[PDB]
C-alpha cells in the first residue's frame, strides 16, 4: 500500500464562444480550441 489518499481534479470544458460560433452557424467545421490553432496558423508562415 502506498497510501489510502488521492488527489483528483475537477472538470474541464469547452463552450462555443469566440469564433467557434461563426464557424458553426456560417461555416460547418467547428475546430476544438480554434483560436490557439488559428493564431498559430497565422504564426507558422513567418516562422
Amino acid at each position: 500500500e502506498d497510501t489510502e489518499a488521492d488527489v483528483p481534479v475537477t472538470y474541464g470544458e469547452m463552450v462555443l464562444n469566440g469564433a467557434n460560433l461563426v464557424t458553426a452557424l456560417v461555416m460547418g467545421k467547428a475546430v476544438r480550441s480554434l483560436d490557439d490553432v488559428g493564431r498559430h496558423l497565422l504564426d507558422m508562415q513567418e516562422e
Binding site: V15, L16, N17, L21, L25
Partner: protein
Amino acid sequence: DGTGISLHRQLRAIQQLARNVQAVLGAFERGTADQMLHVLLEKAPPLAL
C-alpha cells in the same frame, strides 16, 4: 438548456416573428390603398360617354 445554441434558436424565431408581423402591418397599409381604387371604379363611367 442554458446554452448558446438555445439563445440563437430563441432569437431566430423572433427575427422571423418581427419580420412576419411587419408584413401584415404593411398589409393593411397596402390593402387600404388597394381598396381605395375599387369603389372609385364602381362609379366613374368612362370619358367618352
